[PDB]
Amino acid sequence: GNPAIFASGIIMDSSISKQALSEIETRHSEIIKLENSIRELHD
Amino acid sequence: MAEDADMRNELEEMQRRADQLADESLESTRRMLQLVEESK
Amino acid sequence: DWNFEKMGIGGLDKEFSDIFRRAFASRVFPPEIVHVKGILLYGPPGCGKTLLARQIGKMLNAREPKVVNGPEILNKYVGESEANIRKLFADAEEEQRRLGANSGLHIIIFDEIDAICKTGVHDTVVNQLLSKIDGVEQLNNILVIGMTNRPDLIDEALLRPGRLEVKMEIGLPDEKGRLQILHIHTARMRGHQLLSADVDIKELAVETKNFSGAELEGLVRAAQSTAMNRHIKASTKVEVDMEKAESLQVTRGDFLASLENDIKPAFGTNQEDYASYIMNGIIKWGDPVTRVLDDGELLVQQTKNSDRTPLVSVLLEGPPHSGKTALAAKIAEESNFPFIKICSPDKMIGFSETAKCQAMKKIFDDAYKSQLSCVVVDDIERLLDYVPIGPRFSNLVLQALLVLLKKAPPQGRKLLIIGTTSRKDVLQEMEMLNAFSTTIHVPNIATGEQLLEALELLGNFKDKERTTIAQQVKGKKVWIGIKKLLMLIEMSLQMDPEYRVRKFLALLREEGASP
Amino acid sequence: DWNFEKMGIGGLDKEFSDIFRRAFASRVFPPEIVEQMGCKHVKGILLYGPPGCGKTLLARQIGKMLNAREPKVVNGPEILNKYVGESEANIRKLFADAEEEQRRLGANSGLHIIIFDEIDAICKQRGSMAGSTGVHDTVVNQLLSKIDGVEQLNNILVIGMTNRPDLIDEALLRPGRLEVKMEIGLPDEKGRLQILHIHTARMRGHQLLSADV
Amino acid sequence: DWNFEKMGIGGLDKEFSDIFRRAFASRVFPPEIVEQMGCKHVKGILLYGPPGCGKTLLARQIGKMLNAREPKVVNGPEILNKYVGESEANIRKLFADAEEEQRRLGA
Numbered sequence: 024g025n026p027a028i029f030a031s032g033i034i035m036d037s038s039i040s041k042q043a044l045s046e047i048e049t050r051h052s053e054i055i056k057l058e059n060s061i062r063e064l065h066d
Numbered sequence: 067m068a069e070d071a072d073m074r075n076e077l078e079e080m081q082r083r084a085d086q087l088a089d090e091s092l093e094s095t096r097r098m099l100q101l102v103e104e105s106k
Numbered sequence: 107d108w109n110f111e112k113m114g115i116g117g118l119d120k121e122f123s124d125i126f127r128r129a130f131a132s133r134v135f136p137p138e139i140v141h142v143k144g145i146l147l148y149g150p151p152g153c154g155k156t157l158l159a160r161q162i163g164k165m166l167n168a169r170e171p172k173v174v175n176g177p178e179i180l181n182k183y184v185g186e187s188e189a190n191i192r193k194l195f196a197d198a199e200e201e202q203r204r205l206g207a208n209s210g211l212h213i214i215i216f217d218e219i220d221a222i223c224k225t226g227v228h229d230t231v232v233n234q235l236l237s238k239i240d241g242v243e244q245l246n247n248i249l250v251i252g253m254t255n256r257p258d259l260i261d262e263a264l265l266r267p268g269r270l271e272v273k274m275e276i277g278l279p280d281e282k283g284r285l286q287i288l289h290i291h292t293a294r295m296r297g298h299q300l301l302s303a304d305v306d307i308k309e310l311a312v313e314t315k316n317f318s319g320a321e322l323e324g325l326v327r328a329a330q331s332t333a334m335n336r337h338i339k340a341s342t343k344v345e346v347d348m349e350k351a352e353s354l355q356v357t358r359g360d361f362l363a364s365l366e367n368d369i370k371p372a373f374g375t376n377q378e379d380y381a382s383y384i385m386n387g388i389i390k391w392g393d394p395v396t397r398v399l400d401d402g403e404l405l406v407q408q409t410k411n412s413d414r415t416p417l418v419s420v421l422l423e424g425p426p427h428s429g430k431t432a433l434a435a436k437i438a439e440e441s442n443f444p445f446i447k448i449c450s451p452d453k454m455i456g457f458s459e460t461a462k463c464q465a466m467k468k469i470f471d472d473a474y475k476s477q478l479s480c481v482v483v484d485d486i487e488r489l490l491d492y493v494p495i496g497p498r499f500s501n502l503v504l505q506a507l508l509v510l511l512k513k514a515p516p517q518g519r520k521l522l523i524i525g526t527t528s529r530k531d532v533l534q535e536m537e538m539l540n541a542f543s544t545t546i547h548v549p550n551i552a553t554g555e556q557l558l559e560a561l562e563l564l565g566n567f568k569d570k571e572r573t574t575i576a577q578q579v580k581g582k583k584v585w586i587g588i589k590k591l592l593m594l595i596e597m598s599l600q601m602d603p604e605y606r607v608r609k610f611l612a613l614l615r616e617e618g619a620s621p
Numbered sequence: 622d623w624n625f626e627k628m629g630i631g632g633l634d635k636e637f638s639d640i641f642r643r644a645f646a647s648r649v650f651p652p653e654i655v656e657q658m659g660c661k662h663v664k665g666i667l668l669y670g671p672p673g674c675g676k677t678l679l680a681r682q683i684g685k686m687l688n689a690r691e692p693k694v695v696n697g698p699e700i701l702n703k704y705v706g707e708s709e710a711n712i713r714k715l716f717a718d719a720e721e722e723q724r725r726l727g728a729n730s731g732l733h734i735i736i737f738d739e740i741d742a743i744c745k746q747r748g749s750m751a752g753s754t755g756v757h758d759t760v761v762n763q764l765l766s767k768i769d770g771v772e773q774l775n776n777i778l779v780i781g782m783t784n785r786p787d788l789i790d791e792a793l794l795r796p797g798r799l800e801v802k803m804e805i806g807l808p809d810e811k812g813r814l815q816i817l818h819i820h821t822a823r824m825r826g827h828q829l830l831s832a833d834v
Numbered sequence: 835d836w837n838f839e840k841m842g843i844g845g846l847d848k849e850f851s852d853i854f855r856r857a858f859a860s861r862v863f864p865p866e867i868v869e870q871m872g873c874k875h876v877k878g879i880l881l882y883g884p885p886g887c888g889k890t891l892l893a894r895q896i897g898k899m900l901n902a903r904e905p906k907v908v909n910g911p912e913i914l915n916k917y918v919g920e921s922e923a924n925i926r927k928l929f930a931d932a933e934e935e936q937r938r939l940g941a
């Protein structure tokens with residue numbers, strides 16, 4: 024029947040986002056403070 | 067199309083930044099475990 | 107209000123009343139004795155669905171409705187579309203949880219809904235909407251309205267009961283609706299007397315066929331523009347009147363010009379040709395025409411009133427250029443039947459046999475439906491292309507005609523068929539002359555008296571020339587067809603007055619012949 | 622500072638007069654009579670014709686004529702993007718400014734002009750298209766919604782040109798969006814004389830043309 | 835330091851003369867007269883014929899003719915790409931330099 028047909032173009036989709044990265048900064052920031060605290064305790 | 071070429075560059079750059087942030091957090095977590103173990 | 111016209115909308119009065127009856131009856135009905143959460147509108151472009159949505163939102167004493175302009179949901183990030191859609195229903199859930207039943211109504215508007223509903227993003231969004239509209243939690247204080255111009259492109263699962271219940275179709279307004287729309291759009295003019303006294307709205311409404319609201323408003327606007335330009339001069343520096351701007355009367359001529367040049371219905375037109383088959387009318391140049399017409403009437407009444415002969419056929423015979431088709435058309439038009447049609451080879455050029463057969467079959471099938479009908483076929487030999495060499499012709503069409511000539515229609519219906527040709531012997535040889543029930547003969551002009559009478563009726567020659575023509579003609583017999591006679595007269599009139607007569611006579615001598 | 626002569630369009634005289642009449646008469650006269658009369662302005666134009674007739678020249682000259690913001694240009698299909706849902710952002714960015722102005726200054730704002738070129742490269746019939754990706758349908762729906770949506774925006778003008786008017790989807794070509802749809806065509810003898818005179822003016826000015834012509 | 839005999843093309847005197855006349859005549863003269871005459875330059879050339887007659891040779895030799903920037907070259911369909919809206923990107927990347935230089939230095 025129909026000859027072999029070409030495929031169409033692709034449309035990718037990035038995952039990470041600026042605001043979600045601000046949220047990841049919220050995640051990361053507290054860790055350093057907690058680290059300062061634990062280092063104090065050990066010292 | 068350099069106008070959108072820069073948007074893609076920014077996207078990928080923030081991907082790299084997020085990767086670095088995650089790695090730094092993981093190394094932190096490991097250091098916390100080490101110190102907490104040490105005190106005992 | 108429920109008047110439906112205080113809001114400047116016309117034609118949809120019945121649909122608006124239906125919406126009232128089916129939508130807000132529960133809410134207006136007393137709570138003690140005591141929902142719908144889905145509405146879909148569709149119709150051709152420029153019918154006013156936006157108007158209905160806006161006015162329905164305004165009518166209810168509820169919070170401001172929320173609207174989304176097409177696909178403002180899809181985002182390159184993952185999951186943000188779901189967050190956006192979920193963001194819409196927060197207030198409804200909060201009010202339902204806090205105030206319970208005594209919660210205000212919520213109205214949601216989906217404009218160009220077909221865009222979003224119909225790949226992971228799309229189907230995930232559709233599933234999210236389906237879950238939210240009808241999910242584990244049941245809400246009874248939310249109203250959703252969707253609008254489309256292509257109803258066929260909407261997903262079926264969204265139209266199931268409990269999600270999209272009330273479906274409305276908006277159509278083209280009737281004459282009354284057009285009148286209402288014109289009244290609404292011209293009330294502003296009539297209030298300030300800026301309208302001319304020569305304009306009749308009824309005439310425009312009759313004229314304006316298949317004009318949706320858009321078309322009518324645009325015509326009004328074009329009239330405005332014409333009147334408006336009447337008071338401005340362009341070329342050097344755009345300059346206006348400022349003086350007659352006070353008058354700015356809108357004449358009917360502006361309306362006619364706007365309708366003619368810069369507006370169009372955008373719908374197809376129907377072409378007629380039945381007039382074209384009788385160009386020069388019929389003139390009684392002799393007895394035979396009366397006899398032919400009388401026989402036609404007799405056959406018409408026999409087919410009309412007979413009980414056990416529902417089908418009747420007749421054949422028209424005559425030499426070429428004797429004007430046969432015109433008589434058939436005249437008889438058909440005198441028949442005064444609901445259904446009349448003419449099958450001609452003119453429209454079938456380059457067709458193969460199968461196409462001709464199918465066309466004839468279609469025409470006869472259409473004729474069958476009505477109660478009593480009449481059909482006419484002309485130039486049979488051209489229909490079944492025929493050539494004296496060989497001879498050669500098409501057998502398939504001949505068989506189709508022979509079968510169709512003696513097939514009675516469904517019970518209690520009447521059919522008449524009239525055929526015209528100019529070569530009887532050929533049809534006789536093909537064994538077709540037996541099928542027809544009766545025949546009529548169309549003769550030529552024989553005696554000079556008839557020719558003189560025809561000339562007198564035409565009135566193209568004066569007494570002086572007529573004297574010589576009578577002198578030359580009355581002592582001889584003639585043989586000529588009417589069409590050829592007209593051609594000859596037109597031929598002769600070209601030359602200067604001095605020679606016309608002689609030239610004409612010469613031409614007659616050229617065509618002088620006997621049967 | 623404007624004049625008919627300086628634009629230099631030879632063979633189109635009735636067409637330009639018709640454009641002026643049917644699109645700009647409203648915005649010239651005092652606002653008082655217009656408000657009394659309660660009519661709306663047009664919001665679209667669609668030109669077309671065989672190649673090399675003067676469409677783009679006419680559009681650019683019209684843009685030059687008005688005293689308003691600089692027009693925005695869309696050179697062919699320069700909107701499409703690969704990231705999902707990014708075309709619509711590009712489209713909406715165009716009308717963002719006009720919406721802001723209309724919201725802020727209400728009904729006494731300036732004018733804004735948007736020029737689409739080779740429009741048929743974007744807005745094809747939604748149903749009749751390769752059923753592979755939905756980007757085109759979303760683009761068309763976004764444009765239809767934004768040009769005439771529930772919210773009313775009425776200080777914008779859109780001009781479009783093409784070479785094959787048929788392919789455009791019908792929903793866009795109805796009054797209120799794009800109504801004045803004219804046709805450009807080959808000139809006549811007088812138009813040819815006018816064009817030849819137009820392009821030969823400067824030579825005559827500097828006496829660089831032989832009298833024998 | 836250019837000479838016609840240097841390019842070593844034979845049998846195409848008339849065609850080269852016509853191309854030169856209709857393409858490069860405008861840009862060689864003092865600009866004042868051209869400006870008074872108020873015309874714009876030509877920006878297109880097409881070459882066709884049967885295989886093996888000297889088209890690419892003319893293209894290359896004209897490229898080495900002019901005192902200009904290094905020409906860009908597109909070997910057949912080098913612009914097509916799988917993603918959506920990338921072909922147009924490769925096409926519009928070609929004209930960027932001309933656009934910016936025209937906007938900056940004008941005439």
Ligand SMILES: Nc1ncnc2c1ncn2[C@@H]1O[C@H](COP(=O)(O)OP(=O)(O)OP(=O)(O)O)[C@@H](O)[C@H]1O
Nearest residue numbers: 114115116150151152153154155156157255319320
């Ligand atoms: N029955 C009507 N009464 C008054 N105005 C109408 C009517 N029908 C159309 N109009 C005019 O048309 C415009 C409103 O139509 P609207 O945009 O809602 O049409 P639609 O058919 O829903 O849209 P579309 O063509 O995009 O599918 C306004 O100009 C309004 O004046």
Ligand SMILES: Nc1ncnc2c1ncn2[C@@H]1O[C@H](COP(=O)(O)OP(=O)(O)OP(=O)(O)O)[C@@H](O)[C@H]1O
Nearest residue numbers: 384385386387388389426427428429430431432589
């Ligand atoms: N009394 C009349 N009878 C017939 N035709 C008349 C009469 N008076 C005027 N005419 C005109 O004569 C012309 C008749 O030509 P018509 O087409 O009917 O000829 P025909 O016999 O069918 O010819 P052919 O066999 O060449 O097709 C029509 O213009 C008709 O108007």
Ligand SMILES: Nc1ncnc2c1ncn2[C@@H]1O[C@H](COP(=O)(O)OP(=O)(O)OP(=O)(O)O)[C@@H](O)[C@H]1O
Nearest residue numbers: 629630631632633671672673674675676677678816
């Ligand atoms: N009526 C006219 N008067 C004066 N010059 C004209 C006229 N029509 C065309 N021209 C000239 O011819 C050229 C027309 O090019 P333009 O781009 O305007 O045509 P177009 O219709 O846009 O072409 P296309 O169909 O390829 O889009 C310009 O150089 C312009 O100066």
Ligand SMILES: Nc1ncnc2c1ncn2[C@@H]1O[C@H](COP(=O)(O)OP(=O)(O)OP(=O)(O)O)[C@@H](O)[C@H]1O
Nearest residue numbers: 842843844845846883884885886887888889890891
């Ligand atoms: N007029 C000429 N004078 C001198 N040498 C020539 C001439 N025409 C062709 N040649 C020689 O023959 C070769 C033909 O190569 P050329 O690039 O002309 O082919 P082409 O026309 O591009 O081929 P195709 O038509 O298949 O694309 C040249 O490289 C050169 O060596």
